[PDB]
Amino acid sequence: PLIPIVVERAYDIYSRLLRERIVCVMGPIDDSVASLVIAQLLFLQSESNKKPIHMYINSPGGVVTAGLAIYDTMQYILNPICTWCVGQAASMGSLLLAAGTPGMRHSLPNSRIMIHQPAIQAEEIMKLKKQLYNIYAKHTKQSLQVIESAMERDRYMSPMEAQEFGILDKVLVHPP
Amino acid sequence: LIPIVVEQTGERAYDIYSRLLRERIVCVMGPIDDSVASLVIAQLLFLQSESNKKPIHMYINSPGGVVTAGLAIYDTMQYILNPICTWCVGQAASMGSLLLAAGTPGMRHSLPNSRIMIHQPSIQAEEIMKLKKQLYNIYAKHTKQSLQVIESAMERDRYMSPMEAQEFGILDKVLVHPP
Amino acid sequence: LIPIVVRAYDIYSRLLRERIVCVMGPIDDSVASLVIAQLLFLQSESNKKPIHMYINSPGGVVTAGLAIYDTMQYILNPICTWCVGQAASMGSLLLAAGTPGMRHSLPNSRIMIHQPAIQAEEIMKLKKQLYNIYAKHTKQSLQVIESAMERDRYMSPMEAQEFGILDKVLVHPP
Amino acid sequence: LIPIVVEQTGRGERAYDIYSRLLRERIVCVMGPIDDSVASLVIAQLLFLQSESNKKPIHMYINSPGGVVTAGLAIYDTMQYILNPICTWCVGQAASMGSLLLAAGTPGMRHSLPNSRIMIHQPIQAEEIMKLKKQLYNIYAKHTKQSLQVIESAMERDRYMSPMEAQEFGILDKVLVHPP
Amino acid sequence: LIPIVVEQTGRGERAYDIYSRLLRERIVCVMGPIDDSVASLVIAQLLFLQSESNKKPIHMYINSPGGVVTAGLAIYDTMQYILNPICTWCVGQAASMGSLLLAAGTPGMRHSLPNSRIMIHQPIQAEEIMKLKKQLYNIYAKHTKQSLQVIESAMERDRYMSPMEAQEFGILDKVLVHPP
Amino acid sequence: LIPIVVEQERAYDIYSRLLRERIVCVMGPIDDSVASLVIAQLLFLQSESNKKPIHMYINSPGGVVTAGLAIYDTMQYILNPICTWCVGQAASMGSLLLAAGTPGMRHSLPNSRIMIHQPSIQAEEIMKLKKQLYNIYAKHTKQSLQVIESAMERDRYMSPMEAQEFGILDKVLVHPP
Amino acid sequence: LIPIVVEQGERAYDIYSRLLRERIVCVMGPIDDSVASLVIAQLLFLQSESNKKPIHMYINSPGGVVTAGLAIYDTMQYILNPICTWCVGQAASMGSLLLAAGTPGMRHSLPNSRIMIHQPIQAEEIMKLKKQLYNIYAKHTKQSLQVIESAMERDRYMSPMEAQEFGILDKVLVHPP
Amino acid sequence: PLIPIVVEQTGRGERAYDIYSRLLRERIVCVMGPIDDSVASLVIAQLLFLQSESNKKPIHMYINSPGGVVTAGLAIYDTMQYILNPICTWCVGQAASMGSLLLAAGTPGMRHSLPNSRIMIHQPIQAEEIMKLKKQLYNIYAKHTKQSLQVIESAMERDRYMSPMEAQEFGILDKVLVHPP
Amino acid sequence: LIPIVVEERAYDIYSRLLRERIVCVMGPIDDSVASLVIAQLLFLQSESNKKPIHMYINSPGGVVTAGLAIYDTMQYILNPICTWCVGQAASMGSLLLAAGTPGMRHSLPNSRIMIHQPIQAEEIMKLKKQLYNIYAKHTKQSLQVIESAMERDRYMSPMEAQEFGILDKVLVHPP
Amino acid sequence: LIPIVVEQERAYDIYSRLLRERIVCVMGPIDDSVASLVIAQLLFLQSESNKKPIHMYINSPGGVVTAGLAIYDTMQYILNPICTWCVGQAASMGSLLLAAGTPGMRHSLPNSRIMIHQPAIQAEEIMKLKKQLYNIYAKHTKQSLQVIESAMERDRYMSPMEAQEFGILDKVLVHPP
Ligand SMILES: O=C(NCc1ccc(Br)cc1)N1CCN(Cc2cc(F)cc(F)c2)CC1
Ligand SMILES: O=C(NCc1ccc(Br)cc1)N1CCN(Cc2cc(F)cc(F)c2)CC1
Ligand SMILES: O=C(NCc1ccc(Br)cc1)N1CCN(Cc2cc(F)cc(F)c2)CC1
Ligand SMILES: O=C(NCc1ccc(Br)cc1)N1CCN(Cc2cc(F)cc(F)c2)CC1
Ligand SMILES: O=C(NCc1ccc(Br)cc1)N1CCN(Cc2cc(F)cc(F)c2)CC1
Ligand SMILES: O=C(NCc1ccc(Br)cc1)N1CCN(Cc2cc(F)cc(F)c2)CC1
Ligand SMILES: O=C(NCc1ccc(Br)cc1)N1CCN(Cc2cc(F)cc(F)c2)CC1
Ligand SMILES: O=C(NCc1ccc(Br)cc1)N1CCN(Cc2cc(F)cc(F)c2)CC1
Ligand SMILES: O=C(NCc1ccc(Br)cc1)N1CCN(Cc2cc(F)cc(F)c2)CC1
Ligand SMILES: O=C(NCc1ccc(Br)cc1)N1CCN(Cc2cc(F)cc(F)c2)CC1
Ligand SMILES: [Mg+2]
Ligand SMILES: [Mg+2]
Ligand SMILES: [Mg+2]
Ligand SMILES: [Mg+2]
């Protein structure tokens, strides 16, 4: 994990991407990742409350409450958010992908998307699961019944299938 | 420890990998995982913003690794407009050979003693097969071989020499030195 | 802790400014990557000035060693190789691959051409690549190389000189 | 934690870790076990110091239980390759390859502090192990001026020598309490 | 995490970690176990301080359970080699090699705080272990002014001395609550 | 080391001797291995006599729910009266087994502690199991299911007297009558 | 410690050996080559004692190694004997395949068991194994390949009643008739 | 992995055997799990014991193995050829690598698989030595399958399993059985 | 799990083989294996000082002094010793194979034999010289040939080992 | 796994059979556990006969000095002649035990190696133990303390012939006479 430095002032390359309003959600989501992503989103809003923010997602998912913290922050800030699926968006990753601004949810052609979810009481685990159903229903425009049925299936969707389902808007090979 | 080198601009000190990045060289050395993919993708996108026309060099010495991470790099290579020169040094196996093959036509290179493997050295069963079919389609597109030939070749647990890989359509040039 | 010398450089970076590249310890992909980056950087600083490669290595990963070997042949520069301590397995291949006339050992070094999850056929193909490379740089026949590599032993610098692995055994400069 | 010190130069004030400051005084430390990593660092320092001046003495401080023989021999060969006088100093102990480096200092310039201990005993195929051992015998014979027979016999004994005994043996020249 | 402090210099402000700042005041810390790495660092600091001034006192703070005997002896020999007066201070404890270093301070300049504890008891081949032990007896005899017989008997007892008892024994000179 | 005892002569390890007196021990955490052993013992004792009572000694913090349910189903499958005894504690699945003894034959010693709370696969499946537990506790305690669900949310133990009033057990005994 | 029991001359058996004597074979726990070897040896031994008498297979398993499960399955089909399968606790993955492979009419579950047909080398070989499972489930459940494939994609358990309706088992029993 | 005990009626009364020892009394030898020197030693000891009990009666070898150490597999193979007895081999679950070699080395006509087994002839010191061992395997497979060395070499390069029917056609086994006839 | 066989007396299968005068040297040789092999050889000599003993060898070698302890015991007892190489005999394993009674050293057809060998330096060389002397005695090759051959990191086939003088017969089945 | 042998019938593990022949093995490192066992065997053999020789087989790198001294003292305490045999090696405390056999009855096989060199307590106590070893070697070898001290400093092995000349053993035997 040596991070290359680029000259524009010298920045590590992730800090340079942040200057272009790009936030990376790569790898598992936990409280530490959520904290960082939230800090970046709030910083970018203060730099400009109108300019779009790009969120790059390559994630197998992770901790549900951490994912929900990022989701709530995405909705709290005013900015348009362009989400991009590269590699995969599974579990909480696909929720974040779906939560991008309508018209601005993107996937590359070979990505895979999973809405399936591969110590607390049983009732609390179900309450969290219902929160996920409600969020997916809101952003995909599918019924709760369809979301519940689809999330039970242990499978990935192609980008085209995810587009038809309402998780994303555009499948792009290159810019138009 | 990464050595530091000085470039004349006054003088600026770079670690040697950052200096290579300044020359439009991106390294894909070692196993491919999400962390490596993230770094390679960031570098490719940065280089495109510096110039959407100038070639980018991708050095590949890799046993492969995580398929979805490899596909993320592959999709980024196709997304950016730039010519990409791929170079096989040491080995390109599994996802490494896919990236090698995905360089711009005419600009896929190997050094003379490298070894290339398209075999994948041994989620639900159906999903594993879907990924495998995606690999077949990508190799078919860039090698110009049929799906039948690719499927048969990938079943064989072997490496190809650079000349063999050239004949197969994985690369274009086997170079001892510059022309 | 790496000492700093005086612009302030860590001592390995200072050696690199003097066109010295170190191949100390086991060779793996990470070492190969670093050595290759240094060789290519030094070529861009000057495609004519000699590069010094210091080798103290028990060997390591064959494909990583071959990546360094191919880079040594790719760049135009004269490469002076130096054996200090030992050059075994892939280390001795790199030593032998220096520019003719510029392959050196210190007097107490030891050199080994013996090699102390892939298919049997692929292991043999790699071994044959090593035979061909040693034959080319030592000027010995394939038969002699194959026989010598079977023997689990080190050569002294003088014996390695007679074999064609190196050119000069030096106590001090002339 | 390595303390940082400030030195006054021709270009102003510069901050060095204390080992880097010692290197500026032409002092090279060989403390702890000798392996390829230590040899690499010591060799780089010796070659750097030669380039700063091929005439000025270099001080080598040795407190070592020994270590890897080929790594020790790499340092030894570098000591002989550079032109500079090398003052060796035994502090604490010089055992196995450490005592070889101590003995390899420039004649007249091999030193020990009074309470140091020196060991020439040494605490791949059989033939190759013997070849290395014979190389050590030859090097000790050359620098101590003792016969091969005496060196071989002495190296078999699992013991340390005092600085005075090491002086009489030809490993070092001076046992010093303070400067003259 | 080591706090940073700011000093005013000829060029403006310089930031030192607090141990480096103490070194600028000629204070060398010997806290924790003594091994070759600690000895190397302490020796480098003592030699640096001698080069800054061969007359100004050096303060050595000792809070140590002891450690490696040859490493302790390397520090001891360096303390005797440099010309400078050395004030030793026992804070917390000085046990085994720690108490040897404490006792080796310049006569009149060996100090303890009131609640410290001092141990001269000490918590390779048999002959070599005894030779080292005899070196310790000789050093304690020299600096405490007690006979070899008394030192040998005292070192057999698995116990600590109070600062007052250590003063009476000849290990230290002053037990201080605050400056005079 | 398990001591050996002699019966009038045959030598048994002491647990095997207890088994001869129709005593089955459920001590420690419940997992598939414990369930297998307990089930084998219950079925063996039924074959020796389908009428004679079986004593089940329970000192358990609970454990794997499906393993506990396997024991529970076996207790209901065999015809025999089963006397359950709480010694030390019966928590989580342990208290379910205690409650599942034959009515009138569920016992605790005076200093035992009983917990019906479950100290904290897909979410839906975790809830299905939890609902199965509610139904079983309701059946054997004779409390409405609404009361069971509320009580199981409370992270606490009951004394033997409180567990008796709740319908988990029938008798709190210091010694035999 | 495995308790020892006495059978009537008196002979002392460990309790699992006593069960084997009653023609009961336990498949409790993860299935791997070692478990398969033991189960196969027991089935073949029981066939040699009598090629007509029923054999009882008790299943409490989360599944395990597919080829090991298939070795047991093939042995069940090879021997002539009627095989009564019993689900206690759970039968998941390969466990539910063995349950379903009992003799028609003789596949049983206790009331609180859970059954899963979902399944929690090169890609082509993994798919070939998966297709073998589809074919076996189709044969014993009498469902179509399409229905089996769809059902196996769903990460869920079935109740015993739902498994009965699906064709995995024949009887859900609280006690003997 | 507690091994059940079974009781047999003898001339002197009752004898208790662990179930594997009981199978050995019926001339059944198990090769289950990875093959290493320890497994080879036990299998070899059992084959030689069974030969001494009768040099004519068939021996059954049950194979469920991913393979393992090549020299250990070859030790078992050589023992199978050394004893005079007919050896019936049975593939249950899988026979991969050295496991499939042992399966193929059963007496002609007596090599069996159950219907859902999988067979692999692919194989998932100095380089020259590794090749010498590999050539020994080619020669053994050629002898027992009756295929050419060229066909064996090509087939062993492919990282795949064969079904029992495909293994039958290849010459690795003779019969694929659901139940006895 | 070691199977038990009945002869009534019940023996584990290795103990049954010992009743047939078979001693197994399978796996690495260390002091514990040497102790067991030596005890078995001495026991078999006491049962009969004339009847042959069979030693089965499948070993990568191991501790030199432990191997030499077995070797010395083989020479001490009067009995003919038939050695059998199954799988491999490498390093000390091949020394034991070669030390069988002349005419009674056997290999199965697919075994591999290695005489190459994959404290202070002087003591390591003394042990190595002891091995040279023992191989020279039992193979009838010169010290020079043994030293040269042991330097080569390779295995011999049974036929090559026969020609070298390590063994006498390569057998597919009994005659 | 220790093989079992039959004597004319009683079945012994092979080490117990050797003990029946008055053979005690000291193979492997010497620690308190090994000492305890050897001492028990020596005392048992003395009670069977206080006159018949005992054979001690030594293949040992040495080990704990006080444990070795416990065995040594027991060898001297019992009346019996003790034949010591070096097979493989006798190093450190192993060579002390070898040397402590009855005069005329200390044996080595031809390829054995013997080392008298010794490859938390206070320094003084370590020296006291070392002096005890010097005294014991002097007594049994008949060499002076000065010669023993000098020889023990040398990190080397002796051949059986050299050990014979030194006074550690009496006979180097290829086979019985
Ligand atoms: O201070 C600000 N906004 C101004 C600002 C300016 C520069 C930066 Br950097 C960060 C925030 N806010 C940011 C919003 N925050 C609430 C919050 C917190 C949070 F974790 C998530 C949210 F969506 C929202 C309360 C305080
Ligand atoms: O904003 C830009 N490009 C401009 C730019 C300028 C400087 C830098 Br540094 C990085 C990007 N894009 C780059 C393309 N990106 C989508 C994307 C994301 C991705 F992960 C892979 C892709 F191939 C493409 C969306 C945002
Ligand atoms: O960009 C350059 N050369 C110019 C240059 C200038 C400054 C630096 Br720093 C590095 C390279 N090349 C360097 C050679 N590279 C191919 C290559 C790659 C490689 F890994 C090994 C090789 F021997 C050769 C293709 C691109
Ligand atoms: O370049 C130089 N000398 C000049 C120089 C200037 C500044 C520095 Br920093 C280092 C060396 N040499 C130094 C000697 N080196 C060979 C060598 C290498 C080595 F590892 C040990 C040696 F004793 C000698 C070849 C190159
Ligand atoms: O070079 C010097 N002294 C001058 C000097 C000036 C600045 C610094 Br920083 C260090 C030393 N000496 C320092 C003493 N050293 C011998 C030595 C070494 C040692 F490890 C301990 C000692 F007590 C003494 C020999 C070289
Ligand atoms: O074999 C018998 N009963 C007779 C018997 C006699 C001696 C013994 Br020991 C065990 C059982 N049954 C017992 C009931 N069993 C089904 C069963 C299995 C099970 F795991 C739990 C149950 F509650 C019931 C089927 C076969
Ligand atoms: O020997 C027999 N049957 C007789 C018998 C008698 C007592 C016992 Br115990 C075991 C077997 N057969 C049984 C079937 N076996 C092949 C076999 C092996 C196998 F692993 C699974 C099978 F379904 C079938 C071949 C040998
Ligand atoms: O002693 C016998 N045969 C008789 C016999 C009788 C009962 C038993 Br149990 C074992 C062997 N032989 C058996 C064959 N053996 C050599 C051998 C050893 C071996 F490991 C594999 C082989 F194929 C052959 C030599 C001694
Ligand atoms: O007591 C006997 N022989 C008779 C005998 C009888 C039954 C048994 Br069991 C063991 C030995 N000897 C056996 C040989 N032993 C010396 C010995 C020991 C040894 F470890 C290896 C040897 F080659 C020889 C001396 C005592
Ligand atoms: O009771 C006896 N001897 C009689 C006896 C009879 C049968 C047996 Br078995 C063991 C001892 N003694 C044996 C000697 N023992 C003292 C002893 C103990 C010891 F550990 C070592 C010794 F050298 C001596 C005191 C008790
Ligand atoms: Mg103490
Ligand atoms: Mg709680
Ligand atoms: Mg799942
Ligand atoms: Mg493979």
Author numbering:
A (entry chain J): 57 to 64, 71 to 180, 192 to 249
B (entry chain I): 58 to 66, 69 to 181, 193 to 249
C (entry chain H): 58 to 63, 71 to 180, 192 to 249
D (entry chain N), E (entry chain M): 58 to 180, 193 to 249
F (entry chain F): 58 to 65, 70 to 181, 193 to 249
G (entry chain G): 58 to 65, 69 to 180, 193 to 249
H (entry chain A): 57 to 180, 193 to 249
I (entry chain B): 58 to 64, 70 to 180, 193 to 249
What did the published study say regarding this structure?
The mitochondrial caseinolytic protease P (HsClpP), a serine protease in the matrix, is responsible for the homeostasis of mitochondria proteome by degrading misfolded and damaged proteins under the physiological regulation of the AAA+ ATPase chaperone ClpX2,3. By consuming ATP, ClpX recognizes, unfolds, and translocates the tagged proteins into the cylindrical chamber formed by the HsClpP tetradecamer for protein proteolysis. HsClpP is highly expressed in multiple tumor tissues and has been reported to be oncogenic in several types of cancers. In this study, we develop a potent activator ZK53 that is highly selective on HsClpP but inactive toward bacterial ClpP proteins.
